[PDB]
Design a binder for these strands. Structure first.
Length: 90
RNA sequence: GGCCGCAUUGCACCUCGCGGCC
């Protein structure tokens, strides 16, 4: 099982949504959990449907993951895990 | 810049699947 990390990894995201909008919408629902350093969403073949939300505190990430797990975002239940590895900005 | 089709459920941190229309 994935250990806690201050970055959460989200997938099963609706790929039809433009990346800039996607990120603003994500910030709309995750900022309640604590300070966000950055949100990474790419639309490459490999990385579309996915995003990284990088919290300042690990406890924010844990709370965000547990609370928002499965929340239907642009119609699709978000799938949320901790990221495998630390995000670069540190 | 705007539409749309095919394929993709994928762990990233300098681009970066393919095709059609305006």
């Amino acid at each position: 099982e994935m250990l806690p990390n201050q970055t959460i990894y989200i997938n099963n995201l609706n790929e039809k949504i433009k990346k800039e909008e996607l990120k603003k919408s994500l910030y709309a629902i995750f900022s309640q959990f604590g300070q966000i350093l950055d949100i990474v969403a790419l639309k490459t073949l490999k990385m579309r449907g996915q995003a990284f939300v990088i919290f300042k505190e690990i406890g924010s990430a844990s709370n965000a993951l547990r609370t928002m797990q499965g929340f239907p975002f642009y119609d699709k239940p978000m799938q949320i895990a901790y990221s495998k590895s630390d995000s670069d900005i540190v």
